[PDB]
RNA sequence: GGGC
């Protein structure tokens, strides 16, 4: 009863990540460093969308994270 | 499906 906005797959919640010196590998490193499991990541004009577990409550210093309402500005 |  909870699906990724990037994939369709159940068990994910899509977040928008923004911040300075952002890049895919660094983003993935910061998250996994907090012991979070990381699903699909996709780059957008204003940052990255990243899938996380719905029960996870992610706090990562240096980044702003918020549940994505709409997915927009994907580089594709 | 990815480790500054």
Numbering used by the authors: 424 to 499
Question: What text does the study give?
Answer:
The RBD is responsible for binding of Hera to 23S rRNA fragments comprising hairpin 92 and for binding of RNaseP RNA. The Hera RBD forms a modified RNA recognition motif (RRM).
Crystals of Hera_RBD (residues 424-510) in complex with a tetranucleotide were obtained and the structure of the complex was determined to 2.3 Å resolution. The tetranucleotide must have been generated in situ by partial hydrolysis of the 19mer RNA. Based on clear electron density and hydrogen bonding distances, the sequence of the RNA could be assigned as 5′-GGGPyr-3′. The RBD core adopts a similar structure in the RNA-free and RNA-bound form, in agreement with the secondary structure information from NMR. The 5′-guanine (Gua1) of the GGGPyr sequence is base-specifically bound by the N-terminal subdomain of Hera_RBD, a small addendum of 12 residues (A424-W435) unique to Hera. The second nucleotide, Gua2, binds through three hydrogen bonds of the Watson–Crick face to main-chain amide groups (V461, G462 and V464).
